Each structure stands twice: as structure tokens, then as C-alpha cells.
């Protein structure tokens, strides 16, 4: 019931620029960091969808100011199902509850 934003880049320094320009642009909580192979790295933010839409849009234009970093995919989900948090690695962990 809390919005999920995902920026997938090709490369790790591209995705730390993605993850930091997301949490700096708006009040979102970076809860996730997902590796799926072939150099595809996804970072996951959570928050209100006013914050997530602004952060993911500002986080997309920051990766393209990195040399050799591209944005492979980008999506914002405004109200996910409660089924998704137990299966997919998008949920709030215990480490990141102070930024909620």
C-alpha cells in the first residue's frame, strides 16, 4: 500500500548515482538493491507516490550524467498488492526503518 519505485541500470556506479539522487530528490526510503545477472542492478525506493514519482524521474536523469552508465528500465507502482512484499525483495527491512 506504499508506492514502489525501481530504477534498473547497467553497472554498479550507475546505480549508486541512481539510489542517491532518488533519496535526495524526495522523501523516499531506499529499501532494496537487487542483482539479477548480466550486469543489471536494480535499486528500490518506497514512499508516498508524490515522492516516488519525483525521485524516480529525477533519479533517471542522474544516471545519464555518468560515463558508461545507462538506464535499462524504470517503473513506478503506486499501490502494490500485499502479496508482493512477501515474495519480491521490495519490503522494508529492519535496517532501514529509521528512514521510513
Amino acid at each position: 500500500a506504499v508506492a514502489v519505485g525501481m530504477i534498473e541500470t547497467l553497472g554498479f556506479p550507475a546505480v549508486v548515482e541512481a539510489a542517491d539522487a532518488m533519496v535526495k530528490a524526495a522523501r523516499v526510503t531506499l529499501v532494496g538493491y537487487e542483482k539479477i545477472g548480466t550486469g543489471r542492478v536494480t535499486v528500490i525506493v518506497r514512499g508516498d507516490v508524490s515522492e516516488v514519482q519525483a525521485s524516480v524521474s529525477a533519479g533517471t536523469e542522474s544516471v545519464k550524467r555518468v560515463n558508461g552508465g545507462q538506464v535499462l528500465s524504470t517503473h513506478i507502482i503506486a499501490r502494490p498488492h500485499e502479496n508482493l512484499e512477501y515474495v519480491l525483495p521490495i519490503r522494508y527491512t529492519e535496517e532501514v526503518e529509521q528512514f521510513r
Binding site: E17, A21, K24, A25, R27, E51, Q53, A54, S57
Partner: protein, 95 residues
């Protein structure tokens, strides 16, 4: 340019299509000593600035000179994150 401190962020959902993807900060201007003035400016942020950090912000048509802000309606932009200020040959914002 003006030295300013990043106090917060401004999020706008209903905006121009040219303004999408532009990170809008909320800078408060500081004086030459470093005390916060009662003057502020919402500025674009290509160089990623964190909260509380001192930045250099320029006003006017100079905010539209960096190859992606050209056809955007921006009159303020963060051009630099201030590393050090040295006033009268002594350090002021070293850290």
C-alpha cells in the same frame, strides 16, 4: 553565484513537460560569514546536493547553459558543491 545551504526539497506533480526530471531543492542563502539569510531560492540540481550542504547557486539565464537545461524554464541552478571558502587567507568552510 551565491553561496547557499540546502534546507530541503520541493516536489511538484502538476508542472510543465519541460520540468520533468528536474530535481528542485530549497536553498537558503547564507552571508559572507555563514549565517543564514531570510532569503531563499528553489533551484535545479544537476550536481547532487544533500541536505545541509553548502552549494553555489546562480540565477537567471545562466541556469540554462548545460546541454540539457537549455529549453527548460529554469532561473536557478546548483553549479557547484562548495568544498572550502577561504576568507582573508583563513579557512571558513573547510570540514
Amino acid at each position: 553565484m551565491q553561496m547557499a545551504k540546502v534546507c530541503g526539497t520541493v516536489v511538484g506533480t502538476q508542472k510543465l513537460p519541460s520540468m520533468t526530471g528536474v530535481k528542485l531543492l530549497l536553498l537558503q542563502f547564507i552571508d559572507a560569514n555563514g549565517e543564514l539569510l531570510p532569503k531563499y531560492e528553489v533551484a535545479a540540481d544537476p550536481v547532487g546536493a544533500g541536505l545541509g550542504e553548502w552549494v553555489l547557486v546562480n540565477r537567471g539565464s545562466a541556469a540554462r547553459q548545460t546541454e540539457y537545461h537549455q529549453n527548460r524554464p529554469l532561473d536557478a541552478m546548483v553549479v557547484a558543491i562548495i568544498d572550502t571558502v577561504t576568507v582573508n587567507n583563513r579557512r571558513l568552510y573547510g570540514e
